[PDB]
């Protein structure tokens, strides 16, 4: 099963940048969004909600085919409160009707990355619609209940070793979870990037406690959260090493979860040999908007 990337009809670098901007001039627009986070990291997750949905065995699932629109997915336990995400992108979907929705979706993520003042993320045009039955079932993103050999296995269907794992964990620096979302609560309300969530695992004093939803995380008395699956990553010898790496250097982090988010974001897509280079968007800070 092929994916070939096609071009939107005579785009280039500036009509996706136009869309980026669109993006993040809203991002700065609709601040209230879930009590002044903004709608940063929802959009992150949902471009990694998108994509994860891959499996390297057959090339079903990703980003390519844009098949979250399709009810069977966005209806997915595990997608719940990525409407939210969708919502946002629906009026920049408006406005430029041409983007498909995959590069709509891991645009946003990317956007919201440098936007919320990450590394740039570069980004390659060129997902196509696919229809309804493309859509792949639910169930093929992770639990948050489960430990560290369970997400090595896991990320194996999506090609990821450990480095690149533990590097895109680091997106939990970002916003929080929702109880009536996912049966987990908290984590503050950050919506800077950062190589804060490596800190915290190392340097906080987490309590495995039981919430409301009767069910377990990690949680410190500075009012920080953890996810089972997040806590395996210093449980694990593999993972604690690479976590105590990106704790001691912000730009190394920056750098591999750069190349591990579009390797997420790319994951299924064959790309020509004569297809454009990749795109690196300026913020609206670097253009003065
Ligand atoms: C073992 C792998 C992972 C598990 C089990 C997991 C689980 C979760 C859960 C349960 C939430 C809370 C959702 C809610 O209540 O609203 C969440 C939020 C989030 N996840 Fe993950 N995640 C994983 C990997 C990732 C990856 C790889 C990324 C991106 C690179 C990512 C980005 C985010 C973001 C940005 C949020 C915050 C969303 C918000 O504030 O609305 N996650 N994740
Ligand atoms: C501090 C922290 C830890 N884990 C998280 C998992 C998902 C989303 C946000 C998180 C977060 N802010």
């Avoid at 209806?75 to 590069?103: C, M, R, T, V, Y």
Wanted: negative net charge; aromatic residues 14%; contains cysteine.
């Amino acid at each position: 099963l092929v994916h070939v990337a096609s071009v939107e009809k005579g785009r280039s670098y500036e009509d996706f940048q136009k869309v980026y901007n669109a993006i993040a001039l809203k991002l700065r627009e609709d601040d209230e969004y879930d009590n002044y986070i903004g709608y940063g990291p929802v959009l992150v997750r949902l471009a990694w909600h998108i994509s994860g949905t891959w499996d390297k065995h057959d090339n079903t699932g990703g980003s390519y085919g844009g098949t979250y629109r399709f009810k069977k997915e966005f209806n997915d336990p595990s997608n719940a409160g990525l409407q939210n995400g969708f919502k946002f992108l629906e009026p920049i979907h408006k406005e430029f009707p041409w983007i498909s929705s995959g590069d709509l979706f891991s645009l946003g993520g990317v956007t919201a990355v440098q936007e919320m003042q990450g590394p740039k993320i570069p980004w390659r045009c060129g997902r196509v619609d696919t229809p309804e039955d493309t859509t792949p079932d639910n169930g093929r993103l992770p639990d948050a209940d489960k430990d560290a050999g369970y997400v090595r296995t896991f990320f194996q269907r999506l090609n990821m070793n450990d480095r690149e794992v533990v590097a895109l964990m680091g997106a939990h620096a970002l916003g929080k979870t929702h109880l009536k979302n996912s049966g987990y609560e908290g984590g503050g309300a950050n919506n800077v990037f950062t190589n804060e969530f490596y800190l915290n695992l190392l340097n906080e004093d987490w309590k495995l406690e039981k919430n409301d939803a009767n069910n377990e995380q990690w949680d410190s008395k500075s009012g920080y959260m953890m996810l089972p699956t997040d806590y395996s990553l210093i449980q694990d010898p593999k993972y604690l090493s690479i976590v105590k790496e990106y704790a001691n250097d912000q730009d190394k982090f920056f750098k591999d979860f750069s190349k591990a988010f579009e390797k997420l974001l790319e994951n299924g897509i064959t790309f020509p040999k004569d297809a454009p280079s990749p795109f690196i968007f300026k913020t609206l800070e670097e253009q003065g908007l």
